[PDB]
RNA sequence: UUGACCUCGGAUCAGGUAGGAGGACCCGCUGAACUUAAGCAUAUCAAUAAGCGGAGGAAAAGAAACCAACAGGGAUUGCCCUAGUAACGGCGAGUGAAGCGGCAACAGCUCAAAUUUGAAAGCUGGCUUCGGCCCGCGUUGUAAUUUGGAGAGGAUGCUUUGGGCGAGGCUCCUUCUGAGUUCCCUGGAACGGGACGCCACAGAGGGUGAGAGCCCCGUAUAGUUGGAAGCCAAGCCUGUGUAAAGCUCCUUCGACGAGUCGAGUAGUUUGGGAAUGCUGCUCAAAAUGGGAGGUAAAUUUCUUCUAAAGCUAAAUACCGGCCAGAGACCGAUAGCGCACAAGUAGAGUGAUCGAAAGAUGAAAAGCACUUUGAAAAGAGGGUUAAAUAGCACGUGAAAUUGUUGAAAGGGAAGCGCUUGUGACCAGACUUGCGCCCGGCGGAUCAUCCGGUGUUCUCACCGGUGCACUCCGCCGGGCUCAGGCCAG
RNA sequence: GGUUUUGCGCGAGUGUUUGGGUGUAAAACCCGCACGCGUAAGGUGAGAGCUUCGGCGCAUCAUCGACC
RNA sequence: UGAGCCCGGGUCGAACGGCCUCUAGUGCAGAUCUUGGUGGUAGUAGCAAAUACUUCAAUGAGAACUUGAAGGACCGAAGUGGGGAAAGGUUCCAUGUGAACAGCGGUUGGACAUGGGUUAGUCGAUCCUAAGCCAUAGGGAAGUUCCGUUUCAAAGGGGCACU
RNA sequence: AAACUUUCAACAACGGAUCUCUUGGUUCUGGCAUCGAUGAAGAACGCAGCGAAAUGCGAUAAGUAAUGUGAAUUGCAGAAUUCCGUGAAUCAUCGAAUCUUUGAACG
C-alpha cells in the first residue's frame, strides 16, 4: 500500500517523552493560576448510546438544567463554582436525573466556597 | 553533575566560547591566585590580573622569577612580566608569554576599584562562612 | 541556513534569549495555598498535602500509594430520596486532618463586613415628602401623582419606607 | 540529509562514447564539470541505503520479561561469587546482602558528603570506591570528541526506601565516583546488571529491606517465579543414596587401556 | 431670485491605510505526465508535483438544519483502536471512510428580525487654559434590552454591586560565595609516577608548555547586591444614582436570515445517484414550516435538529524566525555544494551551472653574523626537546624516479617441487636434582605444656627445648638427568 | 505487511509504553478504562512407558467410531 | 592448514588495546567504476606561410630576436601611413624586477610592483522629434496581468473687471 | 669488465594515503513569536594612519551618545592615563542618535 509518496509524509513521535512533560507543566501551570480550585470542572455521568455499550456508563458534557435547579445549584452560579454546564442534553428519564441530582449533592457536600472579596 | 539546563557540557561549544571570548571577558579567564600572605589578609583567593601587579612565575621554564607585569596580551591569553625575556637571533631583547594561571600575584596595583573587588568578594566568603557555622 | 552562516562570519553578538514562560509554575503572593506549596513536589503530591483534590474526572492511570488527590413514598418519585421555586443565586448555603485544610475552612467561615447600601439625597426627600402629606396610608401615595410621578406600587414605596427608616 | 547527494544537475554523456555510463555534471569552466556523481561509487555522491529516522530504534520487552530479569538480578546480588566474579572487591565486609541502619543514614549528617564518604569506608565498601577512582582513563576512539571524554568501573549501588529514609541520600553520594543510587520501589536492570554481568555489589538500608517484599506483592499479573529444579546442586543429587543404590555397575574407568 | 436635499466631482486639503519580502507549517484557486494494471486508453499515480492569490505564531475548524435508534450522546481539534471494515470499482490493478468506545484539551457567545418615542439616550473630528467648546455622522437608525433547550412586560420578595492609589510578591537579566601549585624522580615543560593531605548539594565541561576535583574560568545548593517589563495583590481612600442585576409567578405577548432551499441538466470530485461535495445554465418555493434519518408493519404515524449572518483560547502542525540543550551520527574523497575572504573563483547571451582548498612549533624563538653566487639560493654558524618540524612546514604509504651496495641476462619474464653456493638470522646450551664426606653460621628438630583458630583433628603462636636432631652457606667425591649430528 | 523455524515469558489467556502517575528527567519504575488476536467421546493391530510381571497403556496412524 | 596474530630494529609524537556481550555506512582486482596521483611511448612527433639579413659600439652576470650608427630589403597614399565610431577599461607615461606568461632566449613587453597622467560658455552629451514603445480613461482575466493610446473622460490654456 | 634491462636493500625524491586532531556538518528535543511607506529583503558606492577580500559602519562613516565593567589595543608607528580618574578598551550591554544611491520605490 505504498502507492503514493509516503516518505515525504511520515512521522516520527520522538517527541513523546518531550510532550509528556509539556502537557504535565501545562497542568502544572493552571494548578498554580488556580491554586485551591481542582483543575477540572465537574462532569455529570451518562450512560453510552449504542446496545453495545449499554451497560457502561462514562462522563458527559455537562449538568442538564433541570438535575441543576432539583441539586439546589442556580444557573449562572454553576460555571464560576466549578461545574460543567449543558444545554443541549435531556434527562429523559428519572433514572439520569437521580444520578446526577445525587452527584450534584456530594459535591457540595466537599465544597468549600470562600466569601467573595 | 551540572543541573541547570541552561548550562552545557559541549565540548566543541566551549571551546568556540573560549578562543572566541570578546577582551572583557578573557580579563576573567586571565586571573591569577593570590599569595599565602596576601590571602590571610583580604579572604580573597583569585584576582583578575592587571598591568602593575608583582607576580612570582611558579611553573615553566622561568620557574621562580620574580618581577612586574609589563603587558596583558589579551589577544594570545598571555601577561608580560619584566626581565623574563629571550633573545632573538639579531640580539634584540623580546618578552616571552606567560599564561596568568602560572604565577601568584605578590603584590597588587590598589586603586579604588581595586578595592571594591577584594571588598565584593571577602563579602562572599564569611558570608557562608557564617551561613555553613551558624 | 544562508541566514545562519551569515552570523557565524559577522561580528555581530548572538542575542541569547533568557528562558521565559507564558504561564508560571508555582503559585505566588500571600495566601495559605503559596505558602505552602513545596516547588520540589508535583500537583498531586501537594494537593495530599493541602487534603484538597486535583482531579475531578476518572482516574486515567494507576497512582502512588496514598495520594488522595485523584478522584414510605405514596408517589415513586426518585427526588425525595435524595430531599434534604426559588433558590439563591449569588452564593450557596452550606453547613487529623491537615493543616492547610484547616486554614482555608476558617479564611472561608471568617465575618465578612456588610457593606450597607444606603440611598441618595434625593430619594430621601422623596420619601419624606410622600409621609409629610400622607403619614403612613401607603396606598394613597400610590395613588398619588405630584409626589409620586413614577408610579410606584405601594408595596414598593413601603420597603424604601422600611430602608430609609420612617414606616 | 535526504537531499545530500542530489543538489547536483547531472546526466548520462550516452552508451557509444568510451566512458562509464554515469551522470556527470554539465558545465564546462569548473572542476566538478564531467565529474561522475549520483552513485554510492561516486566522490561527492549519494551513499546506498541513506540512514533514515524511522528505524526502530527503541525494543518493546514484556513487563512480565523484564520483572523476571530484575528479580534474577537481584537474587545474584545475594550470591558472593558472583560479585567477585563481576569485579568488585568484596573481602572486608561482611554478610553481602549489606544491611545498614536507617537510623545512622537517615538526616542532614548522611547528607554531607564526608560522613557519606566515611560510612562507605566503615561498613566495608570502601576498597571498591577506590576502586572506581583509580579507574578513570581516557576513552580509546572516536567517543572523545563525542562527548564521552573518560570512562570508569562501577562502585556500589545503594538502595533506600524514599518515605523512610528521607531522599537526602542522594545529595550526600552523587560526587562519589561509581557509587550510585537508587530507591527500592523503581529497581533498574541498567543498575543491577551493568554491561549484562550478574552480581552488582548493593548496600541496603533496614527500611529497604523490610519494604522489598511490599514491593514485590505489588506487582499485578506478576509472582515470583518458580524454578524448573528444586536443588541446584548436582554434587549431593547424584552422589545420594537414592541414586547409587539403583545403579548398575561400571562398564569402565575414566582411561581405558589399549588392547592392540 | 435665494435657500435646502440627492447624485457626482476637485484639492501637494486634515488624519490614515495597501503594495514588497518570507512562505518549513496553514487557507484557497488552477492542475499534469512518467509509473502500475509485465503493452495501454477506464482506473492508478493524484483531488500529488509545477503555476497563481492570501495570513499567523499557529492557521483552519468551531458552539448542531449533528450522531444516532440508544437505558442514549451533545461545539471544534488531535492520538489509539474502529479497519484494510462498511462502501465503490471487469466485484481487475485496486480505492477506501465514518458512528460508538478509551485518552489529550475543554468555554462559550455576538447580531438582524420589536418603537427610547415621557425626550439619538450613540459616535468621528479639531480648538483647547485639559474642563469642556463647537463642526459634523446619523431617524433610509447610532446607544440600552432580547438571540428560540430562549425571551419580553407587569407584579412580587429576597439576594448582588462601582472607581482610584497601592506596600509587597512572581518571572528574567545581573555582582559575590570550596579545597595543594606540599616533598622526590623522568621530562624543554607535570597536567606522569611514588608519598602526605584537603574539598565535595560542586569528581559536567573547557583552558593552562603531557591524563589536573583542590592553577584559572566555570560547576552544586541556597542565599545575597542592582535593574527591566508584564501580571497578581495585603491594605488605604472614596462611592449614590429612587442606578444597575439574578431568580420567582402569570386572567399579557413571544418577531428566528430567498435568486436561498428545491427540480432539470452539464462538468468535476468522493468509499458514497437516497447525486458525497462543489460550480455554471434553465425554471424557481414554504409557514402547526423546513432539513436529515428510522419504518413491510398499513400510512408515510415515529426520532432528532433549525440552513441560507458573525466571533471565540486549549489540546494539533511546523525542512523557516530568536535562541538553548543533546547524539551507540560523520570525521577533510566523509559530514551540507560550502570546517578556509563559498553560492566564492570560474563557465554560459541568458535561465542557470558551480568547484578545489584544514594541521610548523609550547612559544616565531620564522636563520644574527660569516662566506660563495648577478640573483634565486647553497655552505658554515645559530634557534628549538626536535631544521629526521625551513611558513614547498605534524605523521609522511603505494604507483613512479635517482644514487650507492649485491646479483642475473645466446629470441620474454613471472610461478611449483628439490638440492647446491653466497649473504644474513631465531633457537638450543652455559648446568640442575639427589646422596655421602668435612668446615662454618645459626636454633622455626622430635616430644610435652598454655592460648588461639579450624575441615574437630589438623595447624599457628609463646615456652620447653642446647645440639648423634633441624636449616642455610662453602670445599671435595659419586649417581641420575641435561643440547646438535652420527656409529 | 505476510509467513516458517529456534530461544524466552506468561499461559485460556496474552499485550505496561494512546495516555496517566512518579523520576536521580528522552532512561528506569508503576498503572485506570477500553481495545487487538485467541478461548468461552472409546475398541481392535498396534504403539513409547510402567508393572505387584496378572495386566495397565501417552501421543498418533489403519479402521470401526460419537457429536456440531 | 588458512584468513590472520605476536615480537625484534628504525621513524614518530598523544593517545590505544585484550576479554564477554551490543550495534553497523564493516572486509574488493575487476564494474569501457568515481576522485586524486604517476608511467612507457619520449628528450620522440614537432616548434609553418608572409622572400632577409649583416658589421661596429653601448647597456647588462648573460644579447640572433635591447638600443645607437652604418649597409642590404619592404609597405608604395586602394599603405605595413595619419585619425575616429562600436567595443575594451588603465592596456597611456616614468622608475624598478625578471618568480610565472610572451612554442627559443630576453636586459625587452599590452607581464609584475610602485608613483603619475584625462583641465571646455564655443568639441559631444544635455534641448527637439522620427519609425515605434509605455502610462492615463475604460474594458477583460481565478490570477500572476492582457486588451486598450483618444476612447461616450467634468482631462487646459489665456484675458477682462473703479469692489 | 663496463653500459643497458630486471630483482632486493639503504638513503634521497615524486605524491598525499594512514594515524591523531576539529570554533564544521547531520539528526533529535525544549523555551518563545519578532520584517516593511517611521521605507524591508536584495543591489551599489564610499569610510581605517598604514587594507585587497571577509567583517563593521554611512560624509557624525572599522563608527557618536547612554549604561555597565574597570586599565587596555597590538603587525608597526604615534598619542595616551597624570594612575587615585566622568574613566583605556577592535570590551560588553543598549532604551538616544547619524543613516550616501537604488530597490515595494513614490516629482
Partial sequence: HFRKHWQRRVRCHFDQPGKKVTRRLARRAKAAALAPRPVDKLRPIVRCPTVKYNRRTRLGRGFTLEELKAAGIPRLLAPTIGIAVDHRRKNLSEESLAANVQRLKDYKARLILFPRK | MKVRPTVSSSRRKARKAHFSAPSSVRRVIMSAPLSKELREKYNVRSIPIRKGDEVQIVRGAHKDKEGKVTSVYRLKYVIHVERVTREKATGQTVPIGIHPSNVVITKLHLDKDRENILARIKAGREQVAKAKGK | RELQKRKRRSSRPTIRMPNRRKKALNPAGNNIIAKSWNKKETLSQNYTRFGLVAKLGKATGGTAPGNKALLSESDAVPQQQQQENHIRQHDLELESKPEVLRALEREATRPVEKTVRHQSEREREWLQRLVDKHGDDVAAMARDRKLNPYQQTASDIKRRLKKAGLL | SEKAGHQTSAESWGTGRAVARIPRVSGGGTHRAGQGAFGNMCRSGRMFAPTKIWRKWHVKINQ?????????????????????????????????????????????????????????????????????????????????????????????????????????????????????????????????????????????????????????????????????????????????????????????????????
Fill in chain 4, 64 to 260: 512480565g520479561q523484564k520483572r523476571f530479569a530484575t528479580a534474577s538480578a537481584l537474587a545474584a546480588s545475594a550470591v558472593a561469587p558472583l560479585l567477585m566474579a563481576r569485579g568488585h572487591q568484596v573481602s572486608t565486609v561482611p554478610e553481602v546482602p549489606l544491611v545498614v541502619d536507617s537510623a545512622a543514614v537517615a538526616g542532614d549528617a548522611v547528607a554531607k558528603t564526608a560522613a557519606a564518604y566515611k560510612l562507605l569506608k566503615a561498613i566495608g565498601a570502601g576498597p571498591d570506591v577506590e576502586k572506581v577512582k583509580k579507574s578513570k582513563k581516557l576513552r580509546a576512539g572516536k567517543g572523545k570528541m563525542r562527548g564521552r571524554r573518560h570512562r570508569q568501573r562501577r562502585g556500589p549501588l545503594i538502595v533506600y526506601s524514599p518515605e523512610h529514609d528521607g531522599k537526602e541520600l542522594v545529595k550526600g553520594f552523587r560526587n562519589i565516583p561509581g557509587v550510585e543510587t537508587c530507591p527500592v520501589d523503581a529497581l533498574n536492570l541498567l543498575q543491577l546488571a551493568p554491561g549484562g554481568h550478574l552480581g552488582r555489589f548493593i548496600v541496603w538500608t533496614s527500611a529497604a529491606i523490610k519494604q522489598l517484599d511490599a514491593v514485590y506483592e505489588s506487582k499485578k499479573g506478576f509472582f515470583l517465579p518458580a524454578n524448573i529444579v528444586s536443588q541446584a546442586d548436582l554434587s549431593r543429587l547424584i552422589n545420594s543414596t537414592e541414586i547409587q543404590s539403583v545403579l548398575r555397575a561400571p562398564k569402565g574407568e575414566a582411561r581405558t587401556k589399549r588392547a592392540c
